Amino acid sequence: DKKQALLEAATQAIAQSGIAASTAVIARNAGVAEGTLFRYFATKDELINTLYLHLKQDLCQSMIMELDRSITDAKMMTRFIWNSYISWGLNHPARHRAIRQLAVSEKLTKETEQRADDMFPELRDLCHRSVLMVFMSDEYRAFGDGLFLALAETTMDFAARDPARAGEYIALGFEAMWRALTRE
Amino acid sequence: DKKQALLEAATQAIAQSGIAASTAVIARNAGVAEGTLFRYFATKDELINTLYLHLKQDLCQSMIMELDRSITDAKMMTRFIWNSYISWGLNHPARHRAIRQLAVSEKLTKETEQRADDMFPELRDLCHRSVLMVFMSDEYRAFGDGLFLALAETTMDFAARDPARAGEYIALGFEAMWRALTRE
Ligand SMILES: C[C@H](CCC(=O)O)[C@H]1CC[C@H]2[C@@H]3[C@H](O)C[C@@H]4C[C@H](O)CC[C@]4(C)[C@H]3C[C@H](O)[C@]12C
Ligand SMILES: C[C@H](CCC(=O)O)[C@H]1CC[C@H]2[C@@H]3[C@H](O)C[C@@H]4C[C@H](O)CC[C@]4(C)[C@H]3C[C@H](O)[C@]12C
């Protein structure tokens, strides 16, 4: 209720100003007292981690609905996932913009990354597994996520500005992403 | 003089606010009267095209200085070019941020793109030619430039935030770029 309202105004504020967004600004735009914000998130760090999970759950639920679990080929399954990402970001630009900033923030906790991997099993292995970014050492997975998000943002930009060619930008960006971030 | 001052304040303003940056804001920060700005650039469109050329000349002059023209291999020559881009953007973040916005703006004229290709011959063919983005139809070259810039920005971000691994981010981003934007 007030929580959904607070997460929504945090989304918009971080989309616009980054992890720096002020809590009072966020509380104001949710129409709650800043102290009430603190009852929901005592710290900027907690807010970042909860918002990330909230956004990531939203995204993954959208993927679950678009997904044809019969698909066996990893490239084709990866294309469908890319297409659902791109379309989620085009429908919800601030959600994409916020999650992009959260995903690279260094404030995400290992618990949070555990709750990320955990609570969508459907996505673990109705997709066999991986191929994407398997080739990178652990220390660079944040970087490989940053590259994926850079390519997806650019794809969305072009597709929003030139909708008559949206599908073409989507397929070219996918290929770029696939070539960049997978291996033999 | 006042022109260099005006281009410098346009760089900073577009870096911060996009092609939308106001001319009065720009004139103010250059410490000239807005009418004097109009003597240098009568239109926002002219300013965009002149600024782009100014930035692109700066970038290419930096590449000319780093370049070992003996290199024959296209991948190795392309790596050197990427490395000089990344380092130019890390040294001059607003220049990169402005040129990124200009490069995708749709206000760049064909004359301007002619003056782009023209006035750095050294770069045409002390590099044999191309490989990069040759596979795309003409209509998508702006998109392929957007992808290159997305990858380079991300690489710079990580390298500025984690300098002890700057070289590693640079080499991983390069490979991503090379795989995305070239073909067999
Ligand atoms: C679900 C899918 C794995 C499927 C596969 O390759 O078979 C994974 C691989 C890449 C992942 C994305 C990339 O890791 C980039 C982003 C990282 C952010 O932490 C979450 C959203 C984010 C956009 C990710 C969502 C999702 O977990 C993706 C899309
Ligand atoms: C000089 C080099 C061509 C060399 C080669 O592959 O052999 C080209 C190929 C890609 C070019 C870059 C990409 O086209 C992306 C950007 C496009 C902007 O219009 C200029 C800067 C920009 C960053 C370009 C500068 C320069 O002209 C590059 C780096």
Numbering used by the authors:
A (entry chain A), B (entry chain A): 8 to 191
The paper states:
The local transcriptional repressor RamR, which is located directly upstream of ramA, belongs to the TetR family of regulatory proteins and represses the expression of both ramA and ramR. Here, we report the crystal structure of RamR in complex with cholic and chenodeoxycholic acids. Both cholic and chenodeoxycholic acids decreased the DNA-binding affinity of RamR, resulting in increased transcription of ramA.
